[PDB]
Design a protein around this nucleic acid. Structure first.
Ligand SMILES: [K+]
Ligand SMILES: [K+]
Ligand SMILES: [K+]
Ligand SMILES: [K+]
Ligand SMILES: [K+]
Ligand SMILES: [K+]
Ligand SMILES: [K+]
Ligand SMILES: [K+]
Ligand SMILES: [K+]
Ligand SMILES: [K+]
Ligand SMILES: [K+]
Ligand SMILES: [K+]
Ligand SMILES: [K+]
Ligand SMILES: [K+]
Ligand SMILES: [K+]
Ligand SMILES: [K+]
Ligand SMILES: [K+]
Ligand SMILES: [K+]
Ligand SMILES: [K+]
Ligand SMILES: [K+]
Ligand SMILES: [K+]
Ligand SMILES: [K+]
Ligand SMILES: [K+]
Ligand SMILES: [K+]
Ligand SMILES: [K+]
Ligand SMILES: [K+]
Ligand SMILES: [K+]
Ligand SMILES: [K+]
Ligand SMILES: [K+]
Ligand SMILES: [K+]
Ligand SMILES: [K+]
Ligand SMILES: [K+]
Ligand SMILES: [K+]
Ligand SMILES: [K+]
Ligand SMILES: [K+]
Ligand SMILES: [K+]
Ligand SMILES: [K+]
Ligand SMILES: [K+]
Ligand SMILES: [K+]
Ligand SMILES: [K+]
Ligand SMILES: [Mg+2]
Ligand SMILES: [Mg+2]
Ligand SMILES: [Mg+2]
Ligand SMILES: [Mg+2]
Ligand SMILES: [Mg+2]
Ligand SMILES: [Mg+2]
Ligand SMILES: [Mg+2]
Ligand SMILES: [Mg+2]
Ligand SMILES: [Mg+2]
Ligand SMILES: [Mg+2]
Ligand SMILES: [Mg+2]
Ligand SMILES: [Mg+2]
Ligand SMILES: [Mg+2]
Ligand SMILES: [Mg+2]
Ligand SMILES: [Mg+2]
Ligand SMILES: [Mg+2]
Ligand SMILES: [Mg+2]
Ligand SMILES: [Mg+2]
Ligand SMILES: [Mg+2]
Ligand SMILES: [Mg+2]
Ligand SMILES: [Mg+2]
Ligand SMILES: [Mg+2]
Ligand SMILES: [Mg+2]
Ligand SMILES: [Mg+2]
Ligand SMILES: [Mg+2]
Ligand SMILES: [Mg+2]
Ligand SMILES: [Mg+2]
Ligand SMILES: [Mg+2]
Ligand SMILES: [Mg+2]
Ligand SMILES: [Mg+2]
Ligand SMILES: [Mg+2]
Ligand SMILES: [Mg+2]
Ligand SMILES: [Mg+2]
Ligand SMILES: [Mg+2]
Ligand SMILES: [Mg+2]
Ligand SMILES: [Mg+2]
Ligand SMILES: [Mg+2]
Ligand SMILES: [Mg+2]
Ligand SMILES: [Mg+2]
Ligand SMILES: [Mg+2]
Ligand SMILES: [Mg+2]
Ligand SMILES: [Mg+2]
Ligand SMILES: [Mg+2]
Ligand SMILES: [Mg+2]
Ligand SMILES: [Mg+2]
Ligand SMILES: [Mg+2]
Ligand SMILES: [Mg+2]
Ligand SMILES: [Mg+2]
Ligand SMILES: [Mg+2]
Ligand SMILES: [Mg+2]
Ligand SMILES: [Mg+2]
Ligand SMILES: [Mg+2]
Ligand SMILES: [Mg+2]
Ligand SMILES: [Mg+2]
Ligand SMILES: [Mg+2]
Ligand SMILES: [Mg+2]
Ligand SMILES: [Mg+2]
Ligand SMILES: [Mg+2]
Ligand SMILES: [Mg+2]
Ligand SMILES: [Mg+2]
Ligand SMILES: [Mg+2]
Ligand SMILES: [Mg+2]
Ligand SMILES: [Mg+2]
Ligand SMILES: [Mg+2]
Ligand SMILES: [Mg+2]
Ligand SMILES: [Mg+2]
Ligand SMILES: [Mg+2]
Ligand SMILES: [Mg+2]
Ligand SMILES: [Mg+2]
Ligand SMILES: [Mg+2]
Ligand SMILES: [Mg+2]
Ligand SMILES: [Mg+2]
Ligand SMILES: [Mg+2]
Ligand SMILES: [Mg+2]
Ligand SMILES: [Mg+2]
Ligand SMILES: [Mg+2]
Ligand SMILES: [Mg+2]
Ligand SMILES: [Mg+2]
Ligand SMILES: [Mg+2]
Ligand SMILES: [Mg+2]
Ligand SMILES: [Mg+2]
Ligand SMILES: [Mg+2]
Ligand SMILES: [Mg+2]
Ligand SMILES: [Mg+2]
Ligand SMILES: [Mg+2]
Ligand SMILES: [Mg+2]
Ligand SMILES: [Mg+2]
Lengths: 118, 209, 114, 56, 123
RNA sequence: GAGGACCGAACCGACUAAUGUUGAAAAAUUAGCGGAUGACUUGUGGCUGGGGGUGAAAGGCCAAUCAAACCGGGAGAUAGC
RNA sequence: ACACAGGUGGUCAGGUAGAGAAUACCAAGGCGCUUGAGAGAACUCGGGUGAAGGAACUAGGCAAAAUGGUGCCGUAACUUC
RNA sequence: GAAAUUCCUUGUCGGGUAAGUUCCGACCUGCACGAAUGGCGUAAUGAUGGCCAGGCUGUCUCCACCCGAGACUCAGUGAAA
RNA sequence: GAUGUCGGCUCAUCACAUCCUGGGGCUGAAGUAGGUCCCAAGGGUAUGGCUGUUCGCCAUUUAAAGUGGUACGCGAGCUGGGUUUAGAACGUCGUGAGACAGUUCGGUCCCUAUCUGCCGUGGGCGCUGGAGAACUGAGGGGGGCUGCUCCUAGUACGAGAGGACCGGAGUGGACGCAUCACUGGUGUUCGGGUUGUCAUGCCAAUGGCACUGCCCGGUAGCUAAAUGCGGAAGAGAUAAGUGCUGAAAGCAUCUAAGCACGAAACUUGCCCCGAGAUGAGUUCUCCCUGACUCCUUGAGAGUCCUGAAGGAACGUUGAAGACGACGACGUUGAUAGGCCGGGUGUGUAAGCGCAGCGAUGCGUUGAGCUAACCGGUACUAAUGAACCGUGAGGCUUAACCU
């Protein structure tokens, strides 16, 4: 049973999952739209949107938290200097997912995820 | 004696003045609305059909809506029947409230038990595990033998095996009625009842008593 | 959750003092022996607190007549007549289970000055 | 464990009576580009619900 | 939560210092004895000139347990160790004259009133 | 500064367990295990040949073969089964 | 017999901790092991934690748990000293 | 000396355990020990056989939850007795 | 041209020659407690020490610790201690090789389930116009154990010792079902402490790796050791047994006619499944009220128009789930994520300042962070469509209106 539980295991261990979403969150902040599998995209929402919410309030402590969670100074700077202000008046829902068929190699269901104001 | 349809809100406790904590299941019993009365002449048996709660119109189909409209009542979230005793009479469109239980000491509560999915024999039937060690080969939670030999050369019906567990109708009998609060549409019974929070419950005066 | 909230709120006590893990508290509880009702005190260190509304509890440890004893009180129970803080303790942890392995000088808790 | 008797072609077919595929019930038509597409998916030219959502 | 092979301290001055449960009395397949339950014991250690000898088989009443006791409001009382009071095998009256450490009100009955009266504290 | 000395990697082994048993492997993997300056271990090359070799001896080993190797021949041995 | 968890003699020997060629994390350098995507049933495999009890398990404490370093104090019977 | 030997036999007595066909100490009625196909001892040694205890524990009472790899679903390839 | 062994473990199923519990006759049955026989198979029916043991003896329980059948039930379910390969030794026998249901130490347990069977779960068609619901209940399954204390009553009985039937109340053991409010376990998705090392330029702050590095706590969920509930009462027909009235047989006789009692067995009462119950049942409600052509002329075929109720599909999903299935929701919207507030958990973040040579302490500060929780909120994603399903539903005979 998994009654009421949240989060996807994605056939990985916890350290792999944490690292992969750190990288993928960085890619989405950098490029503003990426293509990935539909389940990974759904999971990435729960990682990326709290980072933007955090970047709404610029302070040394929040920059350090964002650096702890992304380990990329270019990504932290983009968060606090661009994305925070771009989304200062939006109450959540900073990304949108668009389904786009199936991968050639493995028939995996695919989706684009983008920032809403891209 | 008819019963009423309610909803499992959750569990809590009632502290009494002499220092006893009574665990209770909180059951929300909104007014039950009589939608059909069945009798010997037309249906061959005596019962009432009730609805309760509310439903959204675009999820109410035309056949359901016609049934409710004949009754003259608003659509609820489902329909349930209760058989009538010899001296019980009701009329279509009547409302029955939780005050029906005001003087009832004990109740039977029926619900759909929580769903465990496919369960093994240890959990489903309380089978004993075999050795964790002492040489056991791949057989720690497995069922063991399932029969005899050439006689009878088959497995008997009703053999206890792995399969779906829970998610089925269950009645718990003879629960104390701790509180009837008609103003808040509340029934408080002592102890646990089947089903997840939010689920539908059928509550009747206890058959054993 | 409002129905159960109302049911719980009407039962909560209104005069529970503030206390922290590491404090010494005296709890006065009702004891019935036949027809008589009297208060018995239980005083010791608070080693755990469960903050859970009407279901709040706290655990008190003492060494009694040569024997360690723990009582888990249900905070809003009418059996508990009163709680009073005798001494304020200075600890870091929320749960002081390590005190179970300590006696005498090793089990002392510094006073919290404030 | 293994069969004692060779199963028949008839029984093979009976087992496969559940194997057929099902075609997509119907495709959707983008209100701007007019392309057919799987419902709730973008079009091959990158439209969704009449908006050019992605380039190429 | 005492079972066969559980070792218990002795809350009296009978002379026994360590006893082992060898049977939970009072029912077929009965698993556990708690506070206020009678068990069969063997004496595994005793002081030299006491009232009982190492190797004796007799009865005892459990008076303190680590698992503890629950009260009608949900509260719990737990002790640091398991302890019992030795009883004569036939009369089920205590063998010692003194009781050491606190006991609980679960012993408040006609059977264990001597223990209740002798205990330094009753919780 | 002795030692078929001691603890312990490489190196040489193979005491226990799980796995594996149409294997990842026709003898292994994993966790533990023994020796580890010696009657030690290892590279290259040499010598011993089948009723024969070699054997700190288990009928062990002598090319995934051993109470008499392998290949060819007598040979279509013989077979009251 | 395989793009096979096996076997294969010699040489080189950085940093921090460390007695160390053990072990952990790294350097130079080299790699992610030639099916992937989901799900989060029973059961199997490899692991983590467990209330009270503590060998009651079992042929048998099998397996597991446990002990584990350096310095100092201290150490019985027996002995071929 | 009831033994790596004792059939009768779980011999009998003592010890250890609540309870001991095993174990230890004895007795001698040695079915069927016995002096280099050596007798009786023996410090040290042993992945050697038996027995007891402290510690320790999911071995067990009696199982529960969790983390991974399969199992299950989709796409590609595609065996076996 | 192979039907694997003793014992253990796991899982059982039947018989009754009944171990307990239920009912009864006789007793050399005062009572309590027994003996013996009859009826009775509903349910129940030890844990340990020794030994490979089955058995047995022993310890300590229990209402009791039943006897047998099922390939001496069960190794394509587990074990492998014993028996029964190859090594080795003792006693013994033999000149010897060797031997011994004598002993002793050591000694590889394979199989991915086609069919039957069984546990679960779907797809098809049927049930005669289609569709959405609520049911009836033929039939099937589950369940059915019992201790102790108190009252009756120190009464009946008994010289005393002792000590009841019948009836009533309470509280347990074992078993079962549900649940998570409490007490707890888990809680690699939350918070903190800390060792070694590498990195982010460095300080400070952080991250990776080392079993989650090692640990201390812990939310939701799952859960037992946690805590609610259950076994019944009642009814019908009976077993053994006990009778009433009563002749055959002037008496007697429970029986031949007639009538009455009588048990955990039987049929019900309680719980679950259940109309594929093809004997395919009932009730409520909803929907469809066009045109033409052809042939072998009929429950015929075809074309145009029409496309309902409803369903399905797709999407967002769920204490529902292996997949199917089942439930919720799709902008006329709280279905999921995010967001806002709260709770919970951890336990006083960072930065700055003060004290101290410094490690560190103190203030700002119960701070900061906080999963699966609670209350809200259209920010994001749940699309306008399209698809399936039709167009008043056979014959015969009655009854009735017509
Ligand atoms: K179960
Ligand atoms: K050499
Ligand atoms: K030879
Ligand atoms: K060869
Ligand atoms: K030869
Ligand atoms: K390393
Ligand atoms: K799955
Ligand atoms: K699954
Ligand atoms: K002898
Ligand atoms: K002999
Ligand atoms: K003995
Ligand atoms: K000789
Ligand atoms: K000699
Ligand atoms: K050895
Ligand atoms: K030895
Ligand atoms: K049987
Ligand atoms: K009987
Ligand atoms: K009798
Ligand atoms: K029976
Ligand atoms: K025997
Ligand atoms: K057989
Ligand atoms: K086997
Ligand atoms: K077979
Ligand atoms: K098997
Ligand atoms: K061996
Ligand atoms: K067959
Ligand atoms: K089927
Ligand atoms: K009773
Ligand atoms: K709980
Ligand atoms: K919990
Ligand atoms: K670090
Ligand atoms: K920095
Ligand atoms: K008569
Ligand atoms: K039907
Ligand atoms: K299902
Ligand atoms: K939401
Ligand atoms: K808090
Ligand atoms: K501070
Ligand atoms: K600070
Ligand atoms: K806080
Ligand atoms: Mg959720
Ligand atoms: Mg995979
Ligand atoms: Mg790691
Ligand atoms: Mg479920
Ligand atoms: Mg078991
Ligand atoms: Mg094996
Ligand atoms: Mg295993
Ligand atoms: Mg047959
Ligand atoms: Mg055949
Ligand atoms: Mg198929
Ligand atoms: Mg040496
Ligand atoms: Mg060798
Ligand atoms: Mg190895
Ligand atoms: Mg050595
Ligand atoms: Mg060594
Ligand atoms: Mg030759
Ligand atoms: Mg030989
Ligand atoms: Mg060879
Ligand atoms: Mg020859
Ligand atoms: Mg010839
Ligand atoms: Mg020939
Ligand atoms: Mg490869
Ligand atoms: Mg290779
Ligand atoms: Mg090498
Ligand atoms: Mg180095
Ligand atoms: Mg290394
Ligand atoms: Mg490099
Ligand atoms: Mg798993
Ligand atoms: Mg496991
Ligand atoms: Mg562990
Ligand atoms: Mg434990
Ligand atoms: Mg803990
Ligand atoms: Mg513990
Ligand atoms: Mg212990
Ligand atoms: Mg044992
Ligand atoms: Mg045993
Ligand atoms: Mg071991
Ligand atoms: Mg270990
Ligand atoms: Mg013998
Ligand atoms: Mg003997
Ligand atoms: Mg003896
Ligand atoms: Mg001897
Ligand atoms: Mg000899
Ligand atoms: Mg001789
Ligand atoms: Mg001589
Ligand atoms: Mg001689
Ligand atoms: Mg000689
Ligand atoms: Mg010799
Ligand atoms: Mg000797
Ligand atoms: Mg050696
Ligand atoms: Mg496939
Ligand atoms: Mg054959
Ligand atoms: Mg009979
Ligand atoms: Mg009787
Ligand atoms: Mg039966
Ligand atoms: Mg029967
Ligand atoms: Mg019955
Ligand atoms: Mg023992
Ligand atoms: Mg034994
Ligand atoms: Mg057999
Ligand atoms: Mg049998
Ligand atoms: Mg078999
Ligand atoms: Mg064997
Ligand atoms: Mg033989
Ligand atoms: Mg052995
Ligand atoms: Mg043997
Ligand atoms: Mg097998
Ligand atoms: Mg069907
Ligand atoms: Mg049938
Ligand atoms: Mg039945
Ligand atoms: Mg229970
Ligand atoms: Mg809760
Ligand atoms: Mg906890
Ligand atoms: Mg933890
Ligand atoms: Mg997180
Ligand atoms: Mg952490
Ligand atoms: Mg630093
Ligand atoms: Mg690294
Ligand atoms: Mg590394
Ligand atoms: Mg009758
Ligand atoms: Mg007469
Ligand atoms: Mg009964
Ligand atoms: Mg819409
Ligand atoms: Mg601080
Ligand atoms: Mg910190
Ligand atoms: Mg402060
Ligand atoms: Mg918050």
């Amino acid at each position: 049973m998994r009654h009421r539980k949240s989060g996807r295991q994605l056939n990985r261990n916890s350290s792999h999952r944490q690292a992969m979403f750190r990288n993928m969150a960085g890619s989405l902040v950098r490029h503003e739209i990426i293509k990935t599998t539909l389940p990974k995209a759904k999971e990435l929402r729960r990682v990326v949107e709290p980072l933007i919410t955090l970047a709404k309030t610029d302070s040394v402590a929040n920059r350090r938290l964002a650096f702890a969670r992304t380990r990329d100074n270019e990504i932290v700077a983009k968060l606090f200097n661009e994305l925070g202000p771009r989304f200062a008046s939006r109450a959540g829902g900073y990304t949108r997912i668009l389904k786009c068929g199936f991968r050639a190699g493995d028939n995996a269901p695919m989706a684009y995820i983008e920032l809403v104001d891209r | 004696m008819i019963g009423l349809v309610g909803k499992k809100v959750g569990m809590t406790r009632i502290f009494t003045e002499d220092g006893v904590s009574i665990p209770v299941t909180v059951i929300e019993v909104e007014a039950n609305r009589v939608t059909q009365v069945k009798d010997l002449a037309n249906d061959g048996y005596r019962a009432i059909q009730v609805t309760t709660g509310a439903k959204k119109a675009n999820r109410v189909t035309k056949p359901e809506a016609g049934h409710f409209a004949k009754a003259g009542v608003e659509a609820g979230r489902g329909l349930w029947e209760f058989r009538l005793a010899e001296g019980e009479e009701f009329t279509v469109g009547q409302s029955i409230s939780v005050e029906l239980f005001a003087d009832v000491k004990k109740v039977d509560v029926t619900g759909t038990s929580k769903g465990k999915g496919f369960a093994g024999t240890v959990k489903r039937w309380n089978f004993r595990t075999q050795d964790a060690t002492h040489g056991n080969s791949l057989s720690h939670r497995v069922p063991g033998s399932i029969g005899q030999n050439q006689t009878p050369g088959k497995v008997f019906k009703g053999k206890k095996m792995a399969g779906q567990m829970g998610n089925e109708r269950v009645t718990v009998q003879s629960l104390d009625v701790v509180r009837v609060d008609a103003e808040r549409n509340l029934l408080l019974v002592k102890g646990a009842v089947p089903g997840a929070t939010g689920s539908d419950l059928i509550v009747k005066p206890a058959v054993k008593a | 959750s409002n129905i159960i909230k109302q049911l719980e709120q009407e039962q909560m006590k209104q005069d529970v003092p503030s206390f922290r893990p590491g404090d010494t508290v005296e709890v006065k509880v009702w004891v019935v022996e036949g027809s008589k009702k009297r208060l018995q005190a239980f005083e010791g260190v608070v080693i755990a607190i469960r903050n859970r509304g009407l279901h709040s509890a706290f655990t008190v440890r003492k060494i009694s007549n040569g024997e360690g004893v723990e009582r888990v009180f249900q905070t809003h129970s009418p059996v508990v007549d009163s709680i009073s803080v005798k001494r304020r303790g200075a600890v870091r942890k929320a749960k002081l289970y390590y005190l179970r392995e300590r006696t005498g000088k090793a089990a002392r808790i510094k006073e919290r000055l404030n | 464990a293994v069969q004692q008797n060779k199963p028949t072609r008839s029984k093979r077919g009976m087992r496969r009576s559940h194997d057929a595929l099902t075609a997509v019930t119907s495709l959707s038509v983008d209100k701007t580009s007019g392309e057919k597409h799987l419902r709730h998916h973008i079009t091959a030219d990158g439209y969704y619900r009449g908006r050019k959502v992605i380039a190429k | 939560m005492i079972q066969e092979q559980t070792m218990l301290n002795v809350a009296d001055n009978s002379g026994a210092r360590r006893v082992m449960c060898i049977k939970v009395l009072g029912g077929s397949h009965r698993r556990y004895a708690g506070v206020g339950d009678i068990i069969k014991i063997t004496i595994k250690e005793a002081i030299p000139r006491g009232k009982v000898k190492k190797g004796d088989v007799l009865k005892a009443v459990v008076v303190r347990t680590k698992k503890g006791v629950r009260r009608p409001d949900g509260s719990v009382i737990r002790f640091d160790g398991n302890a019992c009071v030795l009883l004569n095998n036939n009369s089920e009256q205590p063998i010692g004259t003194r009781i050491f450490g606190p006991v609980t009100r679960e012993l408040r009955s006609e059977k264990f009133m001597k223990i209740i009266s002798l205990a330094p504290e009753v919780l």
